[PDB]
Structure formats: structure tokens, C-alpha cells
């Protein structure tokens, strides 16, 4: 009965990019999803997006370009320790030249190439490549 809201959002965006659409509607939404989509946008994998108020959980409309290839969620938010980070980005990512692991840390929601920069691990959310 909708235990994981980020899982639906990323599966919904993903089932529609393969089809070839140009815009997708996501419902419900959250601070977490909005932060995740921002990480996916600062890097250029999606276009700008618009959030709809409705006095409940809201909805999001996202503008897709074709650059996206996959995005997904790791269902239990496991802990990762910056010495076990390589064993993750070597299992989940397709090549060491692109793709990103997204994880939540005391310093916000970020991507592993920045967690290494600020010297902190945390809990894994997903990936996109």
C-alpha cells in the first residue's frame, strides 16, 4: 500500500523515458524526491521541472530530454562507509567514466563524487546512469 514513495517516482520517470514521452507526472511527492530530482538536474540528465500545489502531497511535472538511460532505488537504505563505497559504485554503475550514486549524508543529499570530496558516508538511496 505505497510503502516507498521514492520507488514509485523513479519507476514512473523510468517507464516513460523508454517509451519516448516528453513530460511525466509524479504523484505523491516529497522533500526527498525534490532533492533527488535536483541532483539529477544539476548534471543534465533531465530538464527543469514544476511542482503543483494542491493542499495535500502535491504532484510534479518533469521535462525529459533523451539523455537519461536508467534511474532506480536500492530498497533498504543500507549504510555505506567511504571504504565500502567502491564495492558499491563498482557493482551498480556501468563504467567509471559516468553515472552517479546518490546518497543521503549529514551534509545533505549528494552524489558519491562529492561525498568523497567532503569526507563522509551515509545511507544509499539510488543511482542514475
Amino acid at each position: 500500500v505505497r510503502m516507498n514513495v521514492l520507488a514509485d517516482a523513479l519507476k514512473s520517470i523510468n517507464n516513460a523515458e523508454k517509451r519516448g514521452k516528453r513530460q511525466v507526472l509524479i504523484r505523491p511527492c516529497s522533500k526527498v524526491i525534490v532533492r533527488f530530482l535536483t541532483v539529477m538536474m544539476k548534471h543534465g540528465y533531465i530538464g527543469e521541472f514544476e511542482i503543483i500545489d494542491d493542499h495535500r502531497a502535491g504532484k510534479i511535472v518533469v521535462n525529459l530530454t533523451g539523455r537519461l538511460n536508467k534511474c532506480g532505488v536500492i530498497s533498504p537504505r543500507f549504510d555505506v562507509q567511504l571504504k565500502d563505497l567502491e564495492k558499491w559504485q563498482n557493482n551498480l554503475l556501468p563504467s567509471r567514466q559516468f553515472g552517479f550514486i546518490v546518497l543521503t549524508t549529514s551534509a545533505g543529499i549528494m552524489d558519491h563524487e562529492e561525498a568523497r570530496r567532503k569526507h563522509t558516508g551515509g545511507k544509499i538511496l539510488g543511482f542514475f546512469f
Partner: protein, 83 residues
């Protein structure tokens, strides 16, 4: 696709669908390369230049090359909205 010197290392550079932005591999015998004429806007006659469009195979065989070409034409002076 470069390296630590810059010089490109690639057999060639494939071209992407203008409606789906997915590269068109070299065994897709359904991707087409439409080529649409300009006119001179005062006499209504063809004059040299034209605009080229690429359309993938998959969006062509799902029945969507039509509206795709239409939007790509409306996006330029070929229909200028008001359709």
C-alpha cells in the same frame, strides 16, 4: 570522445533522432533522413537551402514520425504556429 591529449579517438559519430534523441545505429533500416525545401517568401519559390530532419526507427514504427515531423516543422518558419 577525447583523451588526455585531446585528439578524437572514434571510428565515427552517429546522429541522433530529432524527436527522441536516441542515437541511430548503423543497422537501423527504418531511420530516415527527410529533407524539406525552403521558399523565398516573396514569390513562393524554392531557393537553394533546405532543412534536414532525422527520425529514428522505433518512433517511426510506433506511428509517431508524423506528429514528430509536424512539431519539428512548426518549431521553424515552415508552419509558424496558427495551424
Amino acid at each position: 570522445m577525447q583523451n588526455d591529449a585531446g585528439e578524437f579517438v572514434d571510428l565515427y559519430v552517429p546522429r541522433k533522432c530529432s524527436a527522441s534523441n536516441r542515437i541511430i545505429g548503423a543497422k537501423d533500416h527504418a531511420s530516415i533522413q527527410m529533407n524539406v525545401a525552403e521558399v523565398d517568401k516573396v514569390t513562393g519559390r524554392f531557393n537553394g537551402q533546405f532543412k534536414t530532419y532525422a527520425i529514428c526507427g522505433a518512433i517511426r514504427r510506433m506511428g509517431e514520425s508524423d506528429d514528430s515531423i509536424l512539431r519539428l516543422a512548426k518549431a521553424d518558419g515552415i508552419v509558424s504556429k496558427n495551424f
